[PDB]
Structure formats: structure tokens, C-alpha cells
Design an enzyme around this catalytic site. Structure first.
Site, PDB file in Angstrom:
ATOM      1  N   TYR A  36      15.988  41.252  53.419  1.00 27.75           N
ATOM      2  CA  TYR A  36      14.602  41.741  53.535  1.00 27.75           C
ATOM      3  C   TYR A  36      14.335  42.892  52.649  1.00 27.75           C
ATOM      4  O   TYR A  36      13.325  43.587  52.812  1.00 27.75           O
ATOM      5  CB  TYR A  36      14.250  42.170  54.955  1.00 27.75           C
ATOM      6  CG  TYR A  36      14.120  41.088  55.990  1.00 27.75           C
ATOM      7  CD1 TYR A  36      14.565  39.777  55.772  1.00 27.75           C
ATOM      8  CD2 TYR A  36      13.494  41.373  57.195  1.00 27.75           C
ATOM      9  CE1 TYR A  36      14.439  38.788  56.741  1.00 27.75           C
ATOM     10  CE2 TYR A  36      13.307  40.408  58.139  1.00 27.75           C
ATOM     11  CZ  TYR A  36      13.800  39.135  57.900  1.00 27.75           C
ATOM     12  OH  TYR A  36      13.647  38.182  58.838  1.00 27.75           O
ATOM     13  N   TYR A  43       4.056  35.130  61.099  1.00 22.75           N
ATOM     14  CA  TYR A  43       5.353  35.457  60.541  1.00 22.75           C
ATOM     15  C   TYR A  43       5.932  34.243  59.839  1.00 22.75           C
ATOM     16  O   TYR A  43       5.940  33.165  60.410  1.00 22.75           O
ATOM     17  CB  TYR A  43       6.345  35.876  61.633  1.00 22.75           C
ATOM     18  CG  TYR A  43       7.575  36.540  61.120  1.00 22.75           C
ATOM     19  CD1 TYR A  43       7.486  37.647  60.267  1.00 22.75           C
ATOM     20  CD2 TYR A  43       8.837  36.131  61.511  1.00 22.75           C
ATOM     21  CE1 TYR A  43       8.618  38.297  59.810  1.00 22.75           C
ATOM     22  CE2 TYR A  43       9.992  36.828  61.073  1.00 22.75           C
ATOM     23  CZ  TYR A  43       9.857  37.919  60.253  1.00 22.75           C
ATOM     24  OH  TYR A  43      10.943  38.611  59.813  1.00 22.75           O
ATOM     25  N   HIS A  44       6.579  34.490  58.716  1.00 17.86           N
ATOM     26  CA  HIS A  44       7.178  33.430  57.863  1.00 17.86           C
ATOM     27  C   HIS A  44       6.212  32.419  57.183  1.00 17.86           C
ATOM     28  O   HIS A  44       6.635  31.314  56.801  1.00 17.86           O
ATOM     29  CB  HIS A  44       8.206  32.652  58.679  1.00 17.86           C
ATOM     30  CG  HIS A  44       9.467  33.388  58.915  1.00 17.86           C
ATOM     31  ND1 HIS A  44      10.368  32.996  59.872  1.00 17.86           N
ATOM     32  CD2 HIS A  44       9.996  34.479  58.315  1.00 17.86           C
ATOM     33  CE1 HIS A  44      11.388  33.835  59.880  1.00 17.86           C
ATOM     34  NE2 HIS A  44      11.202  34.719  58.925  1.00 17.86           N
ATOM     35  N   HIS A  48       8.007  36.443  53.203  1.00 20.74           N
ATOM     36  CA  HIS A  48       7.915  37.601  54.108  1.00 20.74           C
ATOM     37  C   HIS A  48       6.862  38.605  53.683  1.00 20.74           C
ATOM     38  O   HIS A  48       7.047  39.784  53.909  1.00 20.74           O
ATOM     39  CB  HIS A  48       9.280  38.317  54.198  1.00 20.74           C
ATOM     40  CG  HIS A  48      10.279  37.573  55.002  1.00 20.74           C
ATOM     41  ND1 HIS A  48      10.944  36.464  54.517  1.00 20.74           N
ATOM     42  CD2 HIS A  48      10.677  37.717  56.285  1.00 20.74           C
ATOM     43  CE1 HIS A  48      11.748  35.988  55.449  1.00 20.74           C
ATOM     44  NE2 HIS A  48      11.584  36.713  56.536  1.00 20.74           N
TER      45      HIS A  48
END
Ligand SMILES: *[C@@H]1O[C@H](CO)[C@@H](O)[C@H](O)[C@H]1NC(C)=O
Ligand SMILES: *[C@@H]1O[C@H](CO)[C@@H](O)[C@H](O)[C@H]1NC(C)=O
Ligand SMILES: [Cu+]
Length: 481
Positions: free
Chosen positions: A119, A333-334, A422
Site C-alpha cells: 500500500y 473499497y477496491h 486503491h
């Protein structure tokens, strides 16, 4: 005229990361070591799938990387259009895909990073190096800054590029998903998500210095940013939350104006968007508009709650937003979004939470913006055509002569070919180009900006827009060192 959605596609992996492949413009998507789930340690491999823009068809899932689980990585495209993916579930590793060798050919290894991480954000610098910083999803040790020399195939720690000044105050992974923007003379602006912005210098042993606060904004994890006019030094920022999860996202919107590296960055605060978003994606289009899609209100992972289903088109020339046609699936998310060479925009994905998880979204669609339609907003407009470019590998400053199929008044821009996962897309930037009519209204000459901090090396799409504002299908070309 609010544009139009195209038909839905459903990949055989969840498209958590996506990349535009140079020259074809095919869309490569990947998940992890499984099609439908992930682990921190990962599966020592990655599943990928590919949408072919020439045929309109998708290929079935393959194990295309057999050494590296590329979930949760850094991504950057290098000076030759190679996709360089770092860390993540295999937290030490660097892999590369060179499209020339085959879009479905094996990813191959490069040197391990000095610091293991996941990340993080990765960006291609004005020297064609790859700078990473942060990223505590995986790995170990303070996730300080390091730089990849792709000629040497080495990674070097930069003692002068500590992570500390970018770390946010609250929430998970407060050193992750930095808003990294490469600029002049090897500099990188970390524009966020921390309200404290910082310049980094990737040359030598490194340096860093404050760039100022982002106006009155709060910490904005998984907000979005895009450099929509590199020549003017403009970056648009939107949304995010005080932590990774746990808090309401914002609809805050700013414009940053970069001058010299190490100097203060100007910040202007715009009218808020209608919808507050965390885990959205932002995409710059060839006319310099920005499309902001997806995201949720109260931020949680693997969740379809408080979805923002209505995207917004932001126009920097008016400082105003307009809503576009709603989608029906959450893109939280994602989720991913990306500009295609035909000036449409991929949106899809979300989830990656196991077999029979109702939050997994394998699907997406391509959104056709207003500029593809006539004034009635429903009839597809005729599109200009670039027949040829004089050169396809030009240096900073160098001219390119662009030969249009039809005579007329045209405007030009180049948009750097990009990839995203992300919410992080450091590769995307737009450069408006003044076109010099060559006499015939058909041949036009533009120059690449003279600074490699503006025209970061690597592949770009050249768009021509006719007098109605209708863009052509881009040609690809590269900016070389
Ligand atoms: C996909 O492949 C089929 C053959 O399997 C081909 O006929 C078709 O034109 C391609 N594209 C679309 C959009 O169906
Ligand atoms: C580039 O940055 C370095 C610091 O590493 C500095 O010595 C030099 O003044 C800068 N070059 C230019 C052309 O501004
Ligand atoms: Cu993730």
C-alpha cells in the site's frame, strides 16, 4: 447531455488493479493470488485478465505472475511503457510487464526493494526512476523512501526521504497511499492524504522539506488527486476521510498550484462536490475535465454501505461539478477507474473478500462522456482521426507533427498512460498542447514541454479534439530521456 453508460462486462477476476497497455490500449486487470480473495502473505502468484479494445472481448483468468502476489502494490509505468509493480502481498518483490513481449506473457522479476512494503505509492520521476514511500499493509521497518534505477536494476534507500513527515494522525496505514506527484528536477510532491504536504528530492541521498498545509482541509485518506494541467502545475484533490476507516468522508475539493520544488504550494478551496466520497477514483479526460466516480460516505472495507452511486464531472474552467448518470453497483473499497484511448472511462470492481461474498464485484462498465455525443446527448458524434505522427519517441522540447484525416480547427492534449489500485494513480497527468496549423488545416505541430518534470518520460496518448470538442481515438507515443 450527461454522457452514457456502455454495456456491462464481468471479469473472471475482481478488477482491483487495472492498467492501460501501451500501443493497443487494452485493459489489463488483476486481483491477487486468487481470483476472489487475498491474504497478507499472499499466494506467491497473481491472476490477471485482459479486455481487448480492438475486439471488445475479455480473456479468461490466467496465472500470469508466478513469483509475486501483486495485491496491494505500488504501480508505475516506466519510460518505455513497462508496468512496474512493487510489494504488496509479496512485500519485497518487484515485477515487470513489458507489453512488447506479450500482454499475456509472464511478468518477470526485478531487484527486491530495500524495504519491504504494501500500500505504498510509487511514481516515475523526471529521470525515469521509480520512487516509492510508505506502505505498511505488509513488510517491516519504518517504510522510508527508496528509488529504482531501471538501467542499473538497483534499489537505493534515500536517507533524506523519511516517511515521518507524511504520516497522518489517525487510523490504519497512516503512511500509505501517498498522493505522489513527480515534478521538476527529480522532485516529488506528496500532496496528501495528510493535510501536511511535503516535497521530496529523489536525487543523491535525498532531501525533504515542507510544502505547506492543504489549506483548511483535514487528513484525507483515500481521497483522490489528479494533475489535470501539468504545464500550469495544477492538481485537483477531492474527498477522503480522517482515517482509513471509521469516519465520514468529505466532499472537499481543492486545486493545488505547484511552482518550484521546495517552495510553498498554492491551495485554493472550491465549492464542495455534491457527494462525499472515500475510496472513489478520479480520471482526467482529454478536454481537462475530471470525472469522480464511486466511493462511500462512512468508510469501511469490503462493504457496500453508504455508496455514492452518482458520479460527478468537475470542470476546472468553471470550478463547478455536474452529476452524471448513476450506476447501480457500489464502487467502494477496491474499485478502479481509468481513461481508455477512445476517451471512454472504465469503472468497476470493488470487494475481493472471498467465495460467496456479496460485496465482490467482478463487473464494470465503460462510461462515454458528453464530448462523445451531439447536443441532444444521445446521438454519437463523428470523431476526427489522427492518420500519423511524424515521431513516436520524442525528447522533451521536441516537435511532433500530427497529421489529421480531415481539415479543420483542432485542439490537442497528451495524457500519460496510467494504472490504478486503491485510489492511487501517480501515472496520470494531462498536458494541454498548442497546435500550429501547418497551412492545410490537417498537419499540425506541437511541442512536448521542455521540462521532464512536466512531461514525465514514458507513454502518452495524443488526443485531437475538433471544433465541436469531440476527441479522436488517441495515438500513442513516448517521451524519451
Ligand atoms: C468477440 O469474439 C467473437 C468470436 O468469438 C467475435 O465474433 C466478436 O466480434 C468479438 N467481439 C464482440 C464484441 O463480440
Ligand atoms: C536540482 O536539485 C538539486 C538538489 O539535489 C540542486 O542542486 C539543483 O540546484 C537543482 N537543479 C536545477 C536546474 O534547478
Ligand atoms: Cu486492499
Amino acid at each position: 447531455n450527461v454522457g452514457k453508460w456502455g454495456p456491462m462486462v464481468k471479469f473472471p477476476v475482481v478488477p482491483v488493479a487495472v492498467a492501460l497497455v501501451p500501443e493497443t490500449g487494452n485493459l489489463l486487470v488483476w486481483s491477487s493470488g486468487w481470483p476472489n480473495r487475498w491474504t497478507t502473505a499472499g499466494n506467491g502468484k497473481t491472476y490477471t485478465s485482459l479486455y481487448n479494445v480492438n475486439t471488445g472481448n475479455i480473456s479468461d483468468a490466467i496465472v500470469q505472475n508466478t513469483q509475486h502476489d501483486m495485491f496491494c502494490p505500488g504501480t508505475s509505468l516506466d519510460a518505455d511503457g513497462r508496468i512496474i509493480v512493487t510489494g504488496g502481498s509479496s512485500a519485497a518483490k518487484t515485477s515487470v510487464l513489458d507489453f512488447k513481449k506479450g500482454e499475456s506473457s509472464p511478468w518477470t522479476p526485478l531487484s527486491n526493494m530495500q524495504i519491504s512494503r504494501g500500500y505504498q505509492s510509487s511514481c516515475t520521476t523526471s529521470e525515469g526512476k521509480i520512487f516509492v514511500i510508505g506502505g505498511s499493509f505488509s513488510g517491516a521497518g519504518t517504510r522510508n523512501g527508496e528509488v529504482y534505477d531501471p538501467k542499473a536494476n538497483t534499489w537505493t534507500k534515500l536517507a533524506g526521504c523519511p516517511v515521518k513527515p507524511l504520516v497522518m494522525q489517525r487510523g490504519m496505514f497512516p503512511d500509505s497511499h501517498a498522493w505522489l506527484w513527480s515534478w521538476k528536477n527529480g522532485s516529488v510532491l506528496q500532496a496528501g492524504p495528510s493535510k501536511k504536504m511535503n516535497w521530496y528530492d529523489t536525487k543523491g541521498t535525498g532531501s525533504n522539506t515542507p510544502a505547506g498545509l492543504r489549506g483548511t482541509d483535514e487528513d484525507s485518506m483515500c481521497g483522490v488527486s489528479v494533475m489535470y494541467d501539468a504545464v500550469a502545475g495544477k492538481i485537483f484533490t477531492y474527498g477522503g476521510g480522517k482515517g482509513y476507516t471509521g469516519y465520514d468522508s468529505t466532499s472537499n475539493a481543492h486545486i493545488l498550484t505547484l511552482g518550484e520544488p521546495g517552495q510553498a504550494v498554492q491551495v485554493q478551496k472550491l465549492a464542495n462536490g455534491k457527494y462525499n466520497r472515500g475510496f472513489a477514483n478520479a480520471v482526467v479526460m482529454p478536454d481537462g475535465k475530471i470525472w469522480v466516480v464511486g466511493g462511500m460516505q462512512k468508510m469501511w472495507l469490503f462493504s457496500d454501505t453508504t455508496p455514492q452511486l452518482t458520479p460527478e464531472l468537475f470542470d476546472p474552467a468553471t470550478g463547478s461539478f455536474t452529476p452524471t448518470t448513476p450506476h447501480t453497483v457500489p464502487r467502494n473499497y477496491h474499485s478502479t477507474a481509468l481513461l481508455m484511448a477512445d476517451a471512454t472511462i472504465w469503472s468497476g470492481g470493488g470487494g475481493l473478500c472471498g467465495a460467496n461474498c456479496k460485496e465482490n464485484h467482478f463487473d464494470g462498465q465503460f462510461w462515454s462522456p458528453p464530448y462523445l455525443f451531439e447536443a441532444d446527448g444521445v446521438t454519437p458524434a463523428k470523431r476526427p482521426v489522427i492518420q500519423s505522427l511524424s515521431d513516436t519517441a520524442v525528447r522533451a522540447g521536441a516537435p511532433i507533427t500530427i497529421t489529421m484525416q480531415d481539415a479543420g480547427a483542432y485542439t490537442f492534449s497528451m495524457i500519460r498512460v496510467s494504472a490504478t489500485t486503491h485510489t492511487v494513480n501517480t501515472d496520470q497527468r494531462r498536458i494541454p498542447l498548442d497546435g500550429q496549423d501547418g497551412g492545410d488545416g490537417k498537419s499540425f505541430t506541437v511541442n512536448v514541454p521542455n521540462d521532464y518534470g512536466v512531461a514525465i518520460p514514458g507513454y502518452y496518448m495524443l488526443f485531437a479534439m475538433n471544433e465541436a470538442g469531440v476527441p479522436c481515438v488517441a495515438q500513442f507515443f513516448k517521451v524519451t530521456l
